[PDB]
Design a protein around this nucleic acid. Structure first.
Lengths: 98, 154, 80, 126, 109, 96
RNA sequence: ACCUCGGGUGGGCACUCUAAGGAGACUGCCGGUGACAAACCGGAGGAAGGUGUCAAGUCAUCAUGGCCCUUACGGCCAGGGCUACACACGUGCUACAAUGGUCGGUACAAAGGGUUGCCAAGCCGCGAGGUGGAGCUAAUCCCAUAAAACCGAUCGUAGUCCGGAUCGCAGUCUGCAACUCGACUGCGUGAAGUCGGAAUCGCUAGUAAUCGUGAAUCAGAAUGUCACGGU
């Protein structure tokens, strides 16, 4: 596949393309200070202003392989790296103990 | 085939002053709580004699009379019919069937006081007229047809 | 969840052939390009067809509807 | 003086005995034995070395040991009876082999094994 | 009439109300401030402290009146071609439970 | 002084260059306050076929140390901030 | 000393607060067996002493063929049609109505990741801790509340006053996307749980065995193998 690994990877600069209207429209909704006439003004926000402004369709993978499973928070890499990284020494502090 | 285990009985009861009774908290402990077990380990022995007139170590000791068998029920081959093995055995066998099956009839009584439905059978062995005494006399006269099979074909 | 924390439905781009089409008579079905797209609670009695890719279903809407999705006119798994 | 340091340990403890001679007085964890405990039998299991060393008239024992469970460091009162007393004298030295209550049992819950269910409690197989 | 249906005795007074379905933590203040004692039965006390514990029967829903609208709203789901009556025509769980086959207490015979 | 260092072997060799080189200059710096092993167990898969019976054990350690200088004037904390690393030690400092 | 006897705090380096790393556990020794010999039986001290295999899942997460789509699976806004109950079951927590049928209470869990995060005592509460925010780089804390105990009530042993499967409608929280369907279990209702027998999962020592997971590429419903089952 070639038209797959370079069309959802570009979500780094398109999901936060605006990035300044996306925070000026999503905090005071969590505030009840909006008036009873003002249910509508905060809802001209992000959808027909072209709809790459939400983030429900992004997924975390590996870098050099691209495996979504086995991905953790302490790496940008996946389950087929940990056996072959710190023995060549690509990961700090990963030491066997008990 | 070697027996490698070492028999380590640990008997020291904090208040009760028994000889053979102390460590028995194993089927009174129903995989649960010890504070639930406090009126039924010794508090039920403080509940046996409360309708009786003795010490609760009197009636407990004499379970080695009539609910303890004489012969053993293990099966053996020669070339034919599978022969069981009747023999005079050391107390670790016959009195092992004089303590744990005496308490095992506790569910078909189902009365008030959880503490009483475990130890409401122990005082029936003064004459020996309870539940575990019926099966012990079944053993002896289901051992007539076997008692000569100890050396010859055994 | 799915309570009435969201009271109204003010959605602007799902609207501009719906709220404008009040003065115009009802002679054409309003076609929909989603399995999600909903419309007002004060327009009650329009026609929306379940959008997935092969053929359309009978959709009958009366005055007493308040609750949930359009997933009942055609089913989720329609027993093929 | 008799101002010493003994320690009983069940479930990774570090105890404090404020020990002195006296007449058989017991106390535990800034409390008495009739004060924190009760509704158990594990209080006078420690009686079994206590009345056989005949120190029921000679010492004051306050072994604070914390942690564990309900009756878990009721297994620590088992240990700390004669540790801070055999650092005084050598009378009851060879007279305590019959009990055997000092060895911190390492057959407790050790490292966690995957594949099984618990330490060495095996799962269902065919 | 007394609790709607004829009532067996030799059991509890608050649990005579807390008779399958709406109750105890809402009637936590009903049986405690009316003065009606939970400590004894519906008969053996004075027979007069039931008169407001009987009026709750015919105010909201009744054993006869629960049968009134047990077919109106189900008629709203069967011939309207909808999906609450697509797994009522079949008999499955409806509100999105363990879905297809091997379900314990939702299908029946 | 608080750091942010790796393990047992790159703080017990990094605090040797701190306290003696700060005692040389006529000042009084306290001794090392310990910190045990950061216990966290790690579980991943290693089998080429997908297998639930196969897990294992890993760990990354995280060891820091509490120190403090009594008379704060030391050039041992600012000038010997560039010395107290070798390859990837990141020495945070505190004026305590 | 003090304290609200929760220790504001000096002092806690000795009558310590979870140790980085460490002499670490024996063929060590005497004696009866055996060819004296491997071992095997017994005693030390001391509240510690003997442990290279089974023509079968992937020309497909790196690899690699005989034919192919070749105005095309180079076009994608895709005009929806994958569970008639008509069964055996790989069956494998839960009870046998009596320790008896419904809670807000006990000496009581409580720290880390924490610069697009974790989300107080909540004012809200029967039980919802959205505006609040003690903690914003956590010997701090948000889920912060809790442990199967006393004698727990009326009444003392039940296929039922454990019983609710389609008829929660409908209640100021992601926020432009809840028009006949979701947590919020408040118990007015609509059941099938009675010694496991035909025969077989399978238990010789820490074991057969019923108290729970906190944290992302920086947005918190990842259940048979759950950080501690205190038996």
């Amino acid at each position: 596949k070639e038209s797959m690994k370079n069309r959802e990877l570009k979500r780094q600069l398109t999901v936060a393309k605006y990035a300044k209207k996306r925070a000026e429209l999503k905090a005071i909704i969590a505030n009840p200070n909006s008036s009873a006439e003002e249910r509508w003004n905060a809802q001209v926000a992000l959808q027909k202003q072209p709809r790459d402004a939400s983030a429900s369709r992004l997924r975390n993978r590996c870098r050099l392989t691209g495996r979504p499973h086995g991905f953790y928070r302490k790496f940008g890499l996946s389950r087929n790296k940990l056996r072959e990284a710190a023995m060549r020494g690509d990961v700090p502090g990963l030491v066997k103990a008990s | 085939r070697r027996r490698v285990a070492a028999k380590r009985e640990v008997l020291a009861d904090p208040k009760y002053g028994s000889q053979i009774l102390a460590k028995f908290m194993n089927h009174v402990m129903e995989s649960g709580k010890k504070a639930v077990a406090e009126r039924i380990v010794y508090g039920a022995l403080d509940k046996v004699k409360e309708r009786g007139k003795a010490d609760p170590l009197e009636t407990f000791e004499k379970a080695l009379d009539a609910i303890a068998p004489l012969v053993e029920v293990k099966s053996r081959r020669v070339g034919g019919a599978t022969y069981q093995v009747p023999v005079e055995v050391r107390p670790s066998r016959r009195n092992a069937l004089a303590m744990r099956w005496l308490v095992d009839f506790a569910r078909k009584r189902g009365e008030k006081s959880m503490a009483l439905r475990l130890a409401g059978e122990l005082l029936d062995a003064a004459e020996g007229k309870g539940a575990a005494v019926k099966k012990r006399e079944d053993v002896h006269r289901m051992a007539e047809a076997n008692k000569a099979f100890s050396h010859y074909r055994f | 969840p799915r309570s009435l924390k969201k009271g109204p439905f003010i959605d602007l781009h799902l609207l501009k052939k719906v709220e404008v089409a009040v003065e115009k008579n009802d002679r054409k079905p309003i076609k929909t390009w989603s399995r999600r797209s909903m419309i007002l609670p004060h327009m009650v009695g329009l026609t929306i067809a379940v959008h997935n890719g092969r053929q359309h279903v009978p959709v009958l809407v009366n005055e007493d509807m308040v609750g949930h999705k359009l997933g009942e006119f055609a089913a989720t798994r329609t027993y093929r | 003086a008799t101002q010493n340091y003994g320690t009983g340990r069940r479930k990774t403890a570090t105890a404090r005995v404020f020990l002195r001679p006296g007449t058989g007085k017991i106390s535990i964890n800034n409390r008495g034995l009739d004060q924190f405990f009760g509704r158990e039998t594990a209080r006078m299991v420690v009686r079994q070395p206590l009345e056989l060393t005949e120190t029921v008239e000679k010492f004051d024992i306050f072994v604070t040991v914390v942690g564990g469970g309900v009756s878990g460091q009721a297994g620590a009162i088992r240990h700390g009876i004669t540790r801070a007393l055999i650092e005084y004298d050598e009378t009851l030295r060879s007279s305590l082999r019959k009990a055997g209550y000092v060895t911190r049992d390492a057959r407790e819950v050790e490292r966690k094994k995957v594949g099984l269910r618990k330490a060495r409690k095996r799962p269902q197989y065919s | 009439r007394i609790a709607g249906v004829n009532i067996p005795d030799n059991k509890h007074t608050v649990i005579s109300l807390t008779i399958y379905g709406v109750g105890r933590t809402t009637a936590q203040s009903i049986c405690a401030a009316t003065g009606v004692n939970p400590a004894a039965k519906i008969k053996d006390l004075s027979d007069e402290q039931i008169d407001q514990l009987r009026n709750e029967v015919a105010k909201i829903t009744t054993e006869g009146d629960l049968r009134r609208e047990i077919n109106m709203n189900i008629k709203r789901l069967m011939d309207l071609g909808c999906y609450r009556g697509l797994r009522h025509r079949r008999g499955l769980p409806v509100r999105g439970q363990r879905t297809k086959t091997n379900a314990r207490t939702r299908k029946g015979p | 002084i608080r750091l942010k260092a790796f393990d047992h072997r790159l703080i017990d060799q990094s605090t040797q260059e701190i306290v003696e080189t700060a005692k040389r200059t006529g000042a009084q710096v306290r001794g090392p306050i310990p910190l045990p092993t950061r216990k966290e167990r790690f579980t991943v898969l290693i089998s080429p076929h997908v297998n639930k019976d196969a897990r294992d054990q890993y760990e990354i350690r995280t060891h820091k140390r509490v120190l403090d200088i009594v008379q704060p004037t030391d050039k041992t904390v600012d000038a010997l901030m560039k010395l107290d690393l070798a390859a990837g030690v990141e020495v945070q400092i505190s004026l305590g």
